[PDB]
Amino acid sequence: GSSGSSGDSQNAGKMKGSDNQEKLVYQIIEDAGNKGIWSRDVRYKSNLPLTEINKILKNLESKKLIKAVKSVAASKKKVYMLYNLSGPSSG
């Protein structure tokens, strides 16, 4: 007659940082989907200043969470979409 368990795996997977700014933005980016989102469109959603959207949008690109993609249009812009996505294909 024995009891007790020695070895359990219980982890949800939280993100470091005592701030909820980089988490609110990243969520808005993934929402955009394959199409992606414009750095600006975020400023409004993330309700954060440009200086914040710039550092945030980038930071994520470092955590392999998102990436910078450019639409077929030859216009000076910058879209951000999940890093897992494959993006545009050749043809």
Side-chain angles (χ1 to χ4, degrees), residues 13-82:
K14 68 172 184 64
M15 195 152 100
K16 195 155 169 184
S18 45
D19 290 324
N20 75 103
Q21 272 51 67
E22 206 160 316
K23 83 169 208 73
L24 171 61
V25 185
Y26 172 67
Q27 292 278 268
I28 292 157
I29 301 172
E30 69 153 277
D31 210 317
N34 306 40
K35 277 204 197 65
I37 187 177
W38 204 34
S39 160
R40 275 83 190 182
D41 280 25
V42 183
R43 270 198 60 202
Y44 324 86
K45 293 312 199 184
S46 57
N47 195 52
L48 285 164
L50 186 277
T51 186
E52 274 298 330
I53 282 60
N54 270 222
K55 78 168 60 190
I56 292 151
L57 281 179
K58 210 90 173 81
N59 270 294
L60 292 168
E61 284 186 330
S62 208
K63 306 159 150 298
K64 290 150 169 173
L65 304 167
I66 68 169
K67 51 168 207 154
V69 177
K70 175 150 198 270
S71 83
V72 51
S75 277
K76 197 74 87 169
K77 304 178 289 202
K78 194 77 75 71
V79 194
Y80 293 85
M81 85 179 67
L82 280 163

